[PDB]
Amino acid sequence: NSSPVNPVVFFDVSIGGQEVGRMKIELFADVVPKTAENFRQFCTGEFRKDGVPIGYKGSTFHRVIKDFMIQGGDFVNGDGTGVASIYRGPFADENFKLRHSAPGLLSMANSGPSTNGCQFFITCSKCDWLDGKHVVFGKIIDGLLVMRKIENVPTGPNNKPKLPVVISQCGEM
Amino acid sequence: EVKASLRALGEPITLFGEGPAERRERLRNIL
Numbered sequence: 001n002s003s004p005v006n007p008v009v010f011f012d013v014s015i016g017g018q019e020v021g022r023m024k025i026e027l028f029a030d031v032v033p034k035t036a037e038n039f040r041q042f043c044t045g046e047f048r049k050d051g052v053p054i055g056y057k058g059s060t061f062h063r064v065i066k067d068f069m070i071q072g073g074d075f076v077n078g079d080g081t082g083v084a085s086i087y088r089g090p091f092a093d094e095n096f097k098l099r100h101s102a103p104g105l106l107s108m109a110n111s112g113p114s115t116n117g118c119q120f121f122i123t124c125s126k127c128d129w130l131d132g133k134h135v136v137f138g139k140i141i142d143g144l145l146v147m148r149k150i151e152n153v154p155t156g157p158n159n160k161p162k163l164p165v166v167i168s169q170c171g172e173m
Numbered sequence: 174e175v176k177a178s179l180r181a182l183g184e185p186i187t188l189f190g191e192g193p194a195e196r197r198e199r200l201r202n203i204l
């Protein structure tokens with residue numbers, strides 16, 4: 001099997017200011033290369049805007065819905081309204097080859113057809129109803145425990161975590 | 174090569190916004 005190895009990235013997560021572990025994510029470059037690359041770069045800080053590296057470092061998980069999903073990646077506004085990509089502005093849904101068939105999957109958040117940006121979510125259960133609407137682009141290969149810790153964080157209105165869920169550090173493995 | 178070495182040591186090959194020199198130094202301190 002001389003197939004190119006998919007990119008592996010990592011998020012070091014902090015809850016209420018306390019470090020709680022590392023999540024390693026495989027980006028399915030061999031299925032959705034454009035979407036995977038956009039994400040990898042926001043993990044490495046390789047994409048710069050006005051000389052400044054931009055990405056997930058220091059961003060948060062602004063919405064946690066136990067038994068459904070955890071969402072973050074809005075390093076623009078930190079509230080779910082932010083949109084940014086290495087392609088400049090929102091980009092098209094590459095394809096819907098992969099499904100939300102299990103917990104631990106990485107999928108692009110959006111606000112309708114072809115509105116992908118920087119925001120993403122991690123599945124906490126199977127999300128059948130989301131197939132074809134959101135582009136699945138990766139999965140947790142290590143640190144499922146961190147995701148469950150994140151999932152259990154207490155939330156308030158609109159399921160906003162009561163304590164800060166921060167990506168203290170990130171990069172590529 | 175720095176990246177392959179860090180990979181061989183199970184260390185991240187790149188931290189957010191890390192440049193070549195910083196990456197080299199990070200590996201240098203581990204060896």
